[PDB]
């Protein structure tokens, strides 16, 4: 939800209070997680494609399964 | 005959499905073909064999990577030709360069092998 912080000097009583809405950090976290997961999945898919290429079959995948 | 079909774009090449064989007449033309079949790699089904199948007579390498070979073959009725095969094969004698082949078979082979990009 939200939080707030208070700054104050030890010898003084004049304090400054600020408020933060956590939604911004929530957006940051969600975007980071989404990007990380997308990168992982794309990496795995690329690795799979690459090993299949390593097998070095001339035809494409669908043609292979059709033959 | 109905046992095979003439390959499109070839005057001396035909394919027998039941036998899964691609044949090229050495010096003879085909005739009467009302139908033709487009060449396709699937036709050269790779022969599986735990020990390489031995071959005799004249043998030529088409694609070492794909185990594609051309074997001299004469039909028992004495019809010279060559069989294009793909699979685990080995030659009893020394393999021979394709340049040894006549221009007729060579032209047919070029048509059949080089993709028409």
UniProtKB/Swiss-Prot annotation, chain A:
Disulfide bonds: none annotated. The keyword Transmembrane helix does not apply. It comes from the Viruses. It is found in: Virion membrane. Keywords: Host-virus interaction, Membrane, Modulation of host cell cycle by viral cyclin-like protein, Modulation of host cell cycle by virus, Viral envelope protein, Virion. Its main location: virion. GO terms for cellular component: membrane; viral envelope; virion membrane. One of its GO terms (biological process) is symbiont-mediated perturbation of host cell cycle progression. Belongs to the baculoviridae E27 family. Interacts with host mus209/PCNA, cdc2 and cdk6. Forms a complex with proteins C42 and p78/83. Acts as a cyclin-like protein and plays a role in the modulation of host cell cycle. May promote G2/S arrest by interacting with host mus209/PCNA, cdc2 and cdk6. The cell cycle arrest is characterized by an intact nuclear envelope, concomitant with sustained activity of host cdc2. However, viral DNA replication still occurs in the arrested cells. This is Occlusion-derived virus envelope protein E27. It comes from Autographa californica nuclear polyhedrosis virus (AcMNPV). The gene is E27. The chain holds residues 7 to 73 of 290 of the full protein.
UniProtKB/Swiss-Prot annotation, chain B:
Signal peptide: none annotated. It comes from the Viruses. Disulfide bonds: none annotated. It is found in: Host cytoplasm; Host nucleus; Virion. Required for occlusion-derived virus (ODV) envelopment and subsequent embedding of virions into polyhedra. This is Protein AC142. The chain holds residues 359 to 475 of 477 of the full protein.
């Amino acid at each position: 939800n939200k939080v707030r912080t208070v700054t104050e000097i030890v010898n003084s009583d004049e304090k400054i209070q600020k408020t933060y809405e956590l939604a911004e950090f929530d957006l940051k976290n969600l975007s980071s997680l989404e990007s990380y997961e997308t990168l992982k999945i794309k990496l795995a898919l690329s690795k799979y494609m690459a090993m299949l290429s390593t097998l070095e079959m001339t035809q494409p995948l669908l043609e292979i399964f059709r033959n | 005959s109905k046992d095979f079909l003439q390959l499109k774009g070839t005057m001396n090449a035909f394919y027998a499905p039941k036998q899964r064989i691609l044949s090229i007449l050495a010096v003879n033309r085909l005739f009467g073909a009302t139908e033709t079949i487009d060449f396709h790699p699937n036709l050269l089904v790779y022969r599986q064999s735990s020990p390489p199948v031995r071959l005799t007579g004249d043998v030529y390498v088409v694609d070492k990577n794909e185990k594609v070979f051309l074997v001299k073959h004469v039909f028992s009725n004495t019809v010279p030709a060559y069989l294009l095969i793909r699979g685990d094969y080995e030659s009893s004698s020394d393999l021979k360069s394709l340049r040894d082949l006549n221009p007729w078979v060579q032209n047919t082979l070029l048509k059949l092998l080089i993709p028409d990009s």
